[PDB]
Each structure stands twice: as structure tokens, then as C-alpha cells.
């Protein structure tokens, strides 16, 4: 569907100022960003892979695709949003006692096939995403 380029560069900066719910409170509910987290954790559960009885394998790569018109209002940077959301989702997987392989990376990207006021987040266990 969308072959990625081989990038092992797992963007690393120590954002001690991590923002997750900040987006909702900034827009003041004009748009509901938290609806993403909601469906994201839902998609995480839908992507749970039956592994050893101790703990289930949760998705690591989440492709969050919104409409162009939504994304532009969110802001053109995937990076800062990715940092906040990945850290938040990674916290969730710990909380649920799930495990994964690689690094939890959430991708925010837009597609013209995706309409305004719509978003889709698909998380899967993807080891073919080198996160070094």
C-alpha cells in the first residue's frame, strides 16, 4: 500500500516536555484530537497478537492518517506530535502489560483519499521498521 523508505533513524531527542492532551486543550475542543488517542488505544487492542501467556504483543508502528484539511490544521510537523503520542501509547502498553519489539512509533500523515473530519489509525506489529 505504501512502501516506506529504509530509515533506521529513530528520531531521538529528550523531550522532557512531552505534550499529548495539550492539543485538545489548545484547540479548546474545536476539533477533538483525543479522539485519536481513543481510537489509537482501541486499534492497539485490535492489533494485539497472541503471544506467550505472560504478555501479549502489542503493535509498535501506528499509521495515523488524517485528511489533508485536518492535518494542516493540526500542524505540518508529524515529529512533535509523534513524540507525544508515541510516549503516551507506550505508557499504555506498559499499563496493560503488553510487550512489543522495536520502538513504538506513531506516524502522522495525510492522504487525499482521506476526507476532512476523518482519521484512521492503524497499528500493527511491524518489525520491518528499523528503529535504531
Swiss-Prot record:
It comes from Mycobacterium tuberculosis (strain ATCC 25618 / H37Rv). The structure of the N-terminal domain remains unchanged upon phosphorylation. This is FHA domain-containing protein FhaA. The chain holds residues 1 to 132 of 527 of the full protein. Interacts with (phosphorylated) MviN and (phosphorylated) PknB via the FHA domain. Binds to the PknB juxtamembrane domain with an affinity that is modulated by the degree and the pattern of phosphorylation of this juxtamembrane domain. Phosphorylated by PknB. The lineage of its organism: Bacteria, Bacillati, Actinomycetota, Actinomycetes, Mycobacteriales. Regulates cell growth and peptidoglycan synthesis by binding to MviN. May inhibit the late stages of peptidoglycan synthesis. It comes from the Bacteria. The modification Phosphothreonine is found at residue 116. It is found in: Cytoplasm. Changing residue 116 to A: Lack of phosphorylation.
Amino acid at each position: 500500500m505504501g512502501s516506506q523508505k529504509r530509515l533506521v533513524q529513530r528520531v531521538e531527542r529528550k523531550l522532557e516536555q512531552t505534550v499529548g492532551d495539550a492539543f485538545a486543550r489548545i484547540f479548546g475542543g474545536s476539533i477533538v484530537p483525543q479522539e485519536v488517542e481513543a481510537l489509537l488505544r482501541r486499534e492497539a487492542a485490535d492489533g494485539i497478537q497472541s503471544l506467550q501467556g505472560n504478555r501479549l504483543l502489542a503493535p509498535n508502528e501506528y499509521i495515523i492518517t488524517l485528511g489533508v484539511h485536518d492535518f494542516e490544521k493540526l500542524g505540518a510537523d508529524p515529529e512533535l506530535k509523534s513524540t507525544g503520542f508515541a510516549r503516551d501509547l507506550a505508557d499504555y502498553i506498559q499499563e496493560q502489560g503488553w510487550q512489543t519489539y522495536g520502538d513504538v512509533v506513531v506516524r502522522f500523515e495525510q492522504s487525499s483519499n482521506l476526507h476532512t473530519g476523518q482519521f484512521r489509525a492503524r497499528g500493527t506489529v511491524n518489525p520491518d521498521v528499523e528503529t535504531h
